[PDB]
Write a protein that binds this ligand. Structure first.
Ligand SMILES: NC(=O)c1ccc[n+]([C@@H]2O[C@H](COP(=O)([O-])OP(=O)(O)OC[C@H]3O[C@@H](n4cnc5c(N)ncnc54)[C@H](OP(=O)(O)O)[C@@H]3O)[C@@H](O)[C@H]2O)c1
Ligand SMILES: O=C(O)CN1C(=O)c2c(c(C(=O)O)cc3ccccc23)S1(=O)=O
Ligand SMILES: O=C(O)CN1C(=O)c2c(c(C(=O)O)cc3ccccc23)S1(=O)=O
Ligand SMILES: O=C(O)CN1C(=O)c2c(c(C(=O)O)cc3ccccc23)S1(=O)=O
Length: 315
C-alpha cells in the first residue's frame, strides 16, 4: 500500500515531497518533476514563502491532466503568528489562494507555540526573545475544526507537539475532530520511539520530517552528525543495492510512518521515489533504530523560553 488511512477516513500517500528551503525559482520545476515521477503528496507551509510557486506547478499539472485534484494530497501549516482564533481562517485562505486550490487535504498547526500577530514571523522583544500570543492551543484547535466544517480543509493536525501537548488536544472539552497527523522530526539519530508509539496508539498518523537530517539547514557543519555519510547506513544501502537516501526514506515507511524528504534536484526527486521495490529486514530496522542519539536538527532554539516550547519534555 502506498497510502495510510487517516482517522478522518482519507488515504494519505506515505511518500511526499518536502518544500522547506526549496528556493522559489526552483520549486515550481521541483513539484512539476515530482508529480511527473509519481508523487501525489506535497508538504507546504506559508512560512516557507514559496507556496505561490508550489501552486503554479500544481495548477499546471492539473491543467495538463497529468493528475486529478482527487489524487493529490496537499498539506500546509498554520504559522505561529496566526494562532488567534480570528486569524486562522484568513491564514488558511491565503495558503489556498497561493496554492491555487479550493481545499487542502491536511492543515497542521505548525508549532504549538503561538507568537504575537504581525508582519514579522518571529516577533522579537528588544532583548531578542520571541513575543508569545496569549491564545491557547485548545482555542486554536477549535478554529482549525471550523475549517473542516467550512469545507476549506479535509483534515486537521499538529506538528512538533510533544506527548503532553497531544494529550491536551485529545482531552479538549468538546473536542469535535481529533488530530489526524502529528508531523515531527524523525530519523536514525532521533528515532522518537516513545512519541510515535503514543500517537499511533491513539490513531494519529505520524509524519517524519527531515528524514535525511536536513543537510541544507543553515549553518550545518561537516563535523556534525551526517546520516547521508554514516558508513553504517551506507553499508545497509549497499547490501540492498540502494542509495543511503533510499534507505533513510524506506526506514520510516516500514515503521508505518509518512515521510517527506525535500529535494529540488530532479535526479534526486526521482531517486527518492524509488523506495517501493525493496524491504529492510527486521534486523536492518533494529540496527537503524540503534543509532538514536536524540539529535535534533530542528529545535526552535530561539523559542525555548516560550510557555509551549515542546522539547523540554523528554517526549
Ligand atoms: N513541521 C515542521 O516544523 C517541519 C520541520 C522540518 C521539515 N518539515 C518538512 O519536512 C521536509 C523534509 O525536511 P528537511 O527539508 O528539513 O530535510 P531533508 O528532507 O532531511 O533533507 C533535505 C536535504 O537533502 C538533500 N537531498 C535530498 N535527496 C537527496 C538524495 N537522494 N541524496 C542526497 N541529498 C539529498 C536535499 O538537497 P537538494 O534539495 O539540493 O537536492 C536537501 O539539502 C521539509 O522540506 C518540510 O517540508 C517540516
Ligand atoms: O477519492 C477520490 O477523490 C476519487 N478517487 C478515488 O477514490 C480513488 C482514486 C484512484 C486513482 O485516481 O488512481 C485510486 C483509488 C484506489 C483505491 C481507492 C480509491 C481510489 S480517485 O479516482 O482519485
Ligand atoms: O496515488 C496514486 O498514485 C494512485 N492512487 C490514488 O490516486 C489513490 C490511491 C488510494 C489507495 O491506494 O488506497 C486511495 C485513494 C483515495 C482517494 C483518492 C486517490 C487515491 S492510489 O491507488 O495510491
Ligand atoms: O525557517 C524558519 O524561519 C523557521 N523554521 C525553522 O527554523 C526550520 C523550519 C523547518 C520547516 O518548518 O519545514 C525546517 C527546519 C529544518 C532544519 C532547521 C530549521 C528548520 S521552520 O519551522 O520554517
Amino acid at each position: 500500500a502506498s497510502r495510510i488511512l487517516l482517522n478522518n477516513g482519507a488515504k494519505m500517500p506515505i511518500l511526499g515531497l518536502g518544500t522547506w528551503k526549496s528556493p522559489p525559482g526552483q520549486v515550481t520545476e521541483a513539484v512539476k518533476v515530482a508529480i511527473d515521477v509519481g508523487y501525489r503528496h506535497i508538504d507546504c507551509a506559508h512560512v516557507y514563502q514559496n507556496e505561490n510557486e508550489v501552486g503554479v506547478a500544481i495548477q499546471e499539472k492539473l491543467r495538463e491532466q497529468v493528475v486529478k485534484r482527487e489524487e493529490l494530497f496537499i498539506v500546509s501549516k498554520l504559522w505561529c503568528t496566526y494562532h488567534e482564533k480570528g486569524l486562522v481562517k484568513g491564514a488558511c485562505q491565503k495558503t489556498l489562494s497561493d496554492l491555487k486550490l479550493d481545499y487542502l487535504d491536511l492543515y497542521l498547526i505548525h508549532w504549538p507555540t503561538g507568537f504575537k500577530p504581525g508582519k514579522e514571523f518571529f516577533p522579537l522583544d528588544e532583548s531578542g526573545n520571541v513575543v508569545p500570543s496569549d491564545t491557547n492551543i485548545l482555542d486554536t484547535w477549535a478554529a482549525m475544526e471550523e475549517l473542516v466544517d467550512e469545507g476549506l480543509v479535509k483534515a486537521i493536525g499538529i506538528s512538533n507537539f510533544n506527548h503532553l501537548q497531544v494529550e491536551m488536544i485529545l482531552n479538549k472539552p468538546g473536542l469535535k475532530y481529533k488530530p489526524a497527523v502529528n508531523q515531527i522530526e524523525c530519523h536514525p539519530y532521533l528515532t522518537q520511539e516513545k512519541l510515535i508509539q503514543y500517537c499511533q496508539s491513539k490513531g494519529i498518523v505520524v509524519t517524519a520530517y527531515s528524514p535525511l537530517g536536513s543537510p541544507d539547514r543553515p549553518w550545518a557543519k561537516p563535523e556534525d552528525p551526517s546520516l547521508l555519510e554514516d558508513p553504517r547506513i551506507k553499508a545497509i544501502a549497499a547490501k540492498h543495492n540502494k542509495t543511503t537516501a533510499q534507505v533513510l526514506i524506506r526506514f520510516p515507511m516500514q515503521r508505518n510512518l509518512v515521510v517527506i524528504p525535500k529535494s529540488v534536484t530532479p535526479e534526486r526527486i526521482a531517486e527518492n521515489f524509488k523506495v517501493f521495490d525493496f524491504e529492510l529486514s527486521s534486523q536492518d530496522m533494529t540496527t537503524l533504530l540503534s543509532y538514536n542519539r536524540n539529535w535534533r536538527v530542528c529545535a526552535l532554539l530561539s523559542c525555548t523560553s516560550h510557555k509551549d516550547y515542546p522539547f523540554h519534555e523528554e517526549f
